[PDB]
Motif scaffolding. Structure first.
Motif, PDB file in Angstrom:
ATOM      1  N   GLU A 311     -22.085  32.261  -3.530  1.00  0.00           N
ATOM      2  CA  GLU A 311     -20.716  32.326  -3.025  1.00  0.00           C
ATOM      3  C   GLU A 311     -20.381  31.084  -2.209  1.00  0.00           C
ATOM      4  O   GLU A 311     -19.224  30.671  -2.134  1.00  0.00           O
ATOM      5  N   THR A 312     -21.410  30.502  -1.602  1.00  0.00           N
ATOM      6  CA  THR A 312     -21.281  29.277  -0.828  1.00  0.00           C
ATOM      7  C   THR A 312     -20.700  28.159  -1.686  1.00  0.00           C
ATOM      8  O   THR A 312     -19.693  27.548  -1.332  1.00  0.00           O
ATOM      9  N   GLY A 313     -21.339  27.910  -2.825  1.00  0.00           N
ATOM     10  CA  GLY A 313     -20.947  26.826  -3.708  1.00  0.00           C
ATOM     11  C   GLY A 313     -19.757  27.136  -4.592  1.00  0.00           C
ATOM     12  O   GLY A 313     -19.005  26.233  -4.964  1.00  0.00           O
ATOM     13  N   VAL A 314     -19.581  28.408  -4.942  1.00  0.00           N
ATOM     14  CA  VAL A 314     -18.449  28.799  -5.779  1.00  0.00           C
ATOM     15  C   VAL A 314     -17.121  28.640  -5.034  1.00  0.00           C
ATOM     16  O   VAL A 314     -16.100  28.284  -5.625  1.00  0.00           O
ATOM     17  N   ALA A 315     -17.148  28.880  -3.727  1.00  0.00           N
ATOM     18  CA  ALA A 315     -15.948  28.782  -2.898  1.00  0.00           C
ATOM     19  C   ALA A 315     -15.390  27.358  -2.816  1.00  0.00           C
ATOM     20  O   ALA A 315     -14.206  27.164  -2.535  1.00  0.00           O
ATOM     21  N   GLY A 316     -16.245  26.372  -3.073  1.00  0.00           N
ATOM     22  CA  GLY A 316     -15.884  24.974  -2.916  1.00  0.00           C
ATOM     23  C   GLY A 316     -14.782  24.472  -3.829  1.00  0.00           C
ATOM     24  O   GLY A 316     -13.931  23.689  -3.408  1.00  0.00           O
ATOM     25  N   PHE A 317     -14.792  24.918  -5.081  1.00  0.00           N
ATOM     26  CA  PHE A 317     -13.811  24.458  -6.056  1.00  0.00           C
ATOM     27  C   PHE A 317     -12.490  25.204  -5.887  1.00  0.00           C
ATOM     28  O   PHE A 317     -12.134  26.042  -6.714  1.00  0.00           O
ATOM     29  N   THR A 318     -11.769  24.888  -4.816  1.00  0.00           N
ATOM     30  CA  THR A 318     -10.551  25.614  -4.466  1.00  0.00           C
ATOM     31  C   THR A 318      -9.413  25.386  -5.461  1.00  0.00           C
ATOM     32  O   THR A 318      -8.711  26.328  -5.836  1.00  0.00           O
ATOM     33  N   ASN A 319      -9.241  24.139  -5.889  1.00  0.00           N
ATOM     34  CA  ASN A 319      -8.173  23.789  -6.823  1.00  0.00           C
ATOM     35  C   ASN A 319      -8.352  24.471  -8.177  1.00  0.00           C
ATOM     36  O   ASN A 319      -7.396  25.004  -8.756  1.00  0.00           O
ATOM     37  N   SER A 320      -9.587  24.456  -8.668  1.00  0.00           N
ATOM     38  CA  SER A 320      -9.938  25.139  -9.908  1.00  0.00           C
ATOM     39  C   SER A 320      -9.616  26.629  -9.807  1.00  0.00           C
ATOM     40  O   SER A 320      -9.027  27.211 -10.723  1.00  0.00           O
ATOM     41  N   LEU A 321     -10.003  27.238  -8.688  1.00  0.00           N
ATOM     42  CA  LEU A 321      -9.716  28.645  -8.423  1.00  0.00           C
ATOM     43  C   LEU A 321      -8.217  28.929  -8.451  1.00  0.00           C
ATOM     44  O   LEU A 321      -7.769  29.915  -9.047  1.00  0.00           O
ATOM     45  N   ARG A 322      -7.450  28.061  -7.797  1.00  0.00           N
ATOM     46  CA  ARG A 322      -5.999  28.192  -7.751  1.00  0.00           C
ATOM     47  C   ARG A 322      -5.401  28.091  -9.149  1.00  0.00           C
ATOM     48  O   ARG A 322      -4.376  28.706  -9.438  1.00  0.00           O
ATOM     49  N   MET A 323      -6.045  27.311 -10.013  1.00  0.00           N
ATOM     50  CA  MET A 323      -5.634  27.252 -11.412  1.00  0.00           C
ATOM     51  C   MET A 323      -5.960  28.562 -12.126  1.00  0.00           C
ATOM     52  O   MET A 323      -5.187  29.033 -12.963  1.00  0.00           O
ATOM     53  N   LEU A 324      -7.110  29.143 -11.789  1.00  0.00           N
ATOM     54  CA  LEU A 324      -7.539  30.406 -12.391  1.00  0.00           C
ATOM     55  C   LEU A 324      -6.593  31.558 -12.067  1.00  0.00           C
ATOM     56  O   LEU A 324      -6.114  32.245 -12.969  1.00  0.00           O
ATOM     57  N   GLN A 325      -6.326  31.765 -10.781  1.00  0.00           N
ATOM     58  CA  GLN A 325      -5.470  32.867 -10.352  1.00  0.00           C
ATOM     59  C   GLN A 325      -4.013  32.654 -10.774  1.00  0.00           C
ATOM     60  O   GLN A 325      -3.203  33.582 -10.733  1.00  0.00           O
ATOM     61  N   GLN A 326      -3.690  31.428 -11.179  1.00  0.00           N
ATOM     62  CA  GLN A 326      -2.373  31.109 -11.725  1.00  0.00           C
ATOM     63  C   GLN A 326      -2.307  31.426 -13.213  1.00  0.00           C
ATOM     64  O   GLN A 326      -1.248  31.312 -13.834  1.00  0.00           O
ATOM     65  N   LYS A 327      -3.452  31.804 -13.776  1.00  0.00           N
ATOM     66  CA  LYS A 327      -3.568  32.170 -15.188  1.00  0.00           C
ATOM     67  C   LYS A 327      -3.270  31.010 -16.141  1.00  0.00           C
ATOM     68  O   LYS A 327      -3.030  31.217 -17.330  1.00  0.00           O
ATOM     69  N   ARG A 328      -3.290  29.791 -15.612  1.00  0.00           N
ATOM     70  CA  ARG A 328      -3.199  28.600 -16.444  1.00  0.00           C
ATOM     71  C   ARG A 328      -4.608  28.235 -16.883  1.00  0.00           C
ATOM     72  O   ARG A 328      -5.287  27.449 -16.220  1.00  0.00           O
ATOM     73  N   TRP A 329      -5.043  28.816 -17.998  1.00  0.00           N
ATOM     74  CA  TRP A 329      -6.441  28.738 -18.418  1.00  0.00           C
ATOM     75  C   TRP A 329      -6.936  27.324 -18.697  1.00  0.00           C
ATOM     76  O   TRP A 329      -7.829  26.826 -18.012  1.00  0.00           O
ATOM     77  N   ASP A 330      -6.356  26.688 -19.708  1.00  0.00           N
ATOM     78  CA  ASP A 330      -6.820  25.384 -20.165  1.00  0.00           C
ATOM     79  C   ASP A 330      -6.801  24.327 -19.059  1.00  0.00           C
ATOM     80  O   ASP A 330      -7.600  23.388 -19.078  1.00  0.00           O
ATOM     81  N   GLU A 331      -5.903  24.493 -18.093  1.00  0.00           N
ATOM     82  CA  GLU A 331      -5.848  23.611 -16.930  1.00  0.00           C
ATOM     83  C   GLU A 331      -7.072  23.818 -16.037  1.00  0.00           C
ATOM     84  O   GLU A 331      -7.685  22.854 -15.559  1.00  0.00           O
ATOM     85  N   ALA A 332      -7.424  25.081 -15.820  1.00  0.00           N
ATOM     86  CA  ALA A 332      -8.607  25.425 -15.041  1.00  0.00           C
ATOM     87  C   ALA A 332      -9.872  24.917 -15.729  1.00  0.00           C
ATOM     88  O   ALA A 332     -10.801  24.438 -15.073  1.00  0.00           O
TER      89      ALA A 332
END
Ligand code: EJ4
Length: 442
Positions: A311-332
């Motif tokens: 969870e330590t390292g997964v939390a780091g990619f904030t922008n990628s996560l924000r792309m994920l929860q935005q449901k913009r798949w290919d961007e993520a």
């Protein structure tokens, strides 16, 4: 009247004669085989012995029933009437009972392999056969005495005489026989085989996914990073001292390990591992809302990442996560593709990322297919179902749908189906000759 009926009657006598020959001799040969040799004495094959006995008994009465369609009456007597009817019903029941017990037993063998070794004995199968015949006798013993000879106008008829009211008990019987000789047993088979058919294909859950990723090794090994790991991705310690790793291993198991553990223990660790992965996903405030906003699959992928690097390292990619929860798949997928993670372990990360992008386990799908015996039993069952589906469904339609006996079109249909249902009993021995190694080498 005769230009119509006679041709069909004689043709049916011929067909019945063939089904009788092949059926009887084939099934008797099989019985003989399963008895004499020892290289054939398994459970599944004993079940086949039951099927053989039943179908041979069915094919023995086939002359007498072609005589029915030729002479349009029952000349032989009443004991013979009782016998042919009783045997007919018996075959109808024991055949499907045996088939579902085979499917259940096959399912036990394949799907529950560790525990199979303990109660899949041939004596079990023999016991089960006897039980099948008794439960059959539940319906067969009454039918044997309720079969009687009564003269319909113009002919002598061998029939079942339900105590008045006749029609009532008649429809009751057609119903119970529709349920317990068709619907229920086929459903049991469909559940069993459904299970052992759905399990074979690809991967469909987090656990089997990680089994494809972290793999499996029984003895201690140095992972992709250079640390002491055992089983499925289970990290032991950072210390380059092997002794330390073993002490931690004995600590996490509870016995003296000797450096090697059993698969049951590897998995018993695996569970707590995916546990802590999840509990960690929930405890971390940066993961939970991105986790809850996903469907099961991508959720599984996120858990793959957390299982791999925490969870330590997964939390780091904030922008990628924000792309994920935005449901913009290919961007993520674009943002994730270029990072330290993809660099370190490229193939695995490529698979996980594709999983993220498409929302399927398509990046993981490798297809195996069935088994020797299992596939055989499948085929036998499919054959029985094809032969007996018409006649079973028909008999219900016939007793519940008007227009019955209206024209030779229908009467021919019905009789064709009675016939097919019978021909199954001759089709069985042919199938064993192509689908089993133990039968074909002989
Ligand atoms: O309750 C049954 C369900 C399924 C079958 C029948 C059952 O009562 C017999 C029955 N009465 C009928 C009345 C009208 C039309 C057909 C039938 C048959 C068909 C059959 O004679 C045949 C089919 N044999 C079985 C054999 C052809 C496979 C078993 C006994 C019977």
């Amino acid at each position: 009247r005769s230009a119509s009926s006679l041709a069909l009657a004689i043709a049916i006598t011929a067909l019945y004669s063939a089904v009788c020959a092949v059926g009887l001799l084939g099934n008797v040969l099989v019985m003989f085989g399963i008895v004499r040799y020892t290289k054939l004495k398994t459970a599944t094959n004993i079940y086949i012995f039951n099927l053989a006995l039943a179908d041979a008994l069915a094919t023995s009465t086939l002359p007498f029933q072609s005589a029915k369609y030729l002479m349009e009456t029952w000349p032989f007597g009443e004991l013979l009437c009782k016998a042919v009817l009783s045997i007919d019903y018996y075959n109808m029941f024991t055949s499907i009972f045996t088939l579902t017990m085979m499917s259940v037993d096959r399912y036990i063998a394949v799907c529950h392999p560790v525990k199979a070794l303990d109660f899949r004995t041939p004596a079990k199968a023999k016991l089960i056969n006897i039980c099948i015949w008794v439960l059959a006798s539940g319906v067969g013993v009454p039918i044997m005495v309720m079969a009687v000879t009564q003269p319909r106008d113009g002919a002598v008829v061998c029939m079942l005489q339900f105590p008045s009211p006749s029609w009532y008990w008649d429809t009751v019987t057609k119903i119970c026989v529709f349920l317990f000789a068709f619907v229920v047993p086929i459903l049991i088979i469909t559940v069993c085989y459904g299970l052992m058919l759905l399990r074979l294909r690809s991967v469909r859950n987090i656990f089997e996914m990680l089994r494809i990723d972290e793999g499996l090794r029984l003895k201690i090994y140095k992972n992709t990073e250079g640390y002491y790991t055992i089983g499925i991705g289970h990290l032991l310690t950072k210390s380059p001292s092997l002794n330390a790793a073993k002490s931690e291993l004995d600590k996490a198991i509870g016995r003296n390990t000797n450096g090697v553990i059993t698969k049951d223990e590897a998995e018993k660790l695996f569970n707590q591992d995916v546990d802590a992965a999840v509990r960690g996903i929930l405890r971390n405030a940066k993961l939970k809302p991105v986790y809850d906003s996903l469907d099961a699959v991508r959720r599984a992928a996120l858990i793959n990442m957390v299982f791999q690097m925490g969870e330590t390292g997964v939390a780091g990619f904030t922008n990628s996560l924000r792309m994920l929860q935005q449901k913009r798949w290919d961007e993520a997928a674009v943002n994730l593709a270029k990072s330290r993670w993809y660099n370190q372990t490229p193939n695995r990360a490529k698979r996980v990322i594709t999983t993220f992008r498409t929302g399927t386990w398509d990046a993981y799908e490798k297809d195996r297919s069935l088994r020797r015996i299992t596939r055989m039993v499948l085929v036998v069952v499919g054959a029985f179902v094809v032969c007996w589906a018409p006649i079973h469904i028909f008999v219900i339609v016939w007793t519940l749908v008007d227009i019955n006996r209206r024209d030779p079109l229908v009467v021919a249909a019905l009789h064709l189906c009675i016939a097919l249902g019978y021909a199954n009993s001759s089709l069985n021995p042919v199938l064993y000759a192509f689908l089993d190694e133990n039968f074909k080498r002989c």
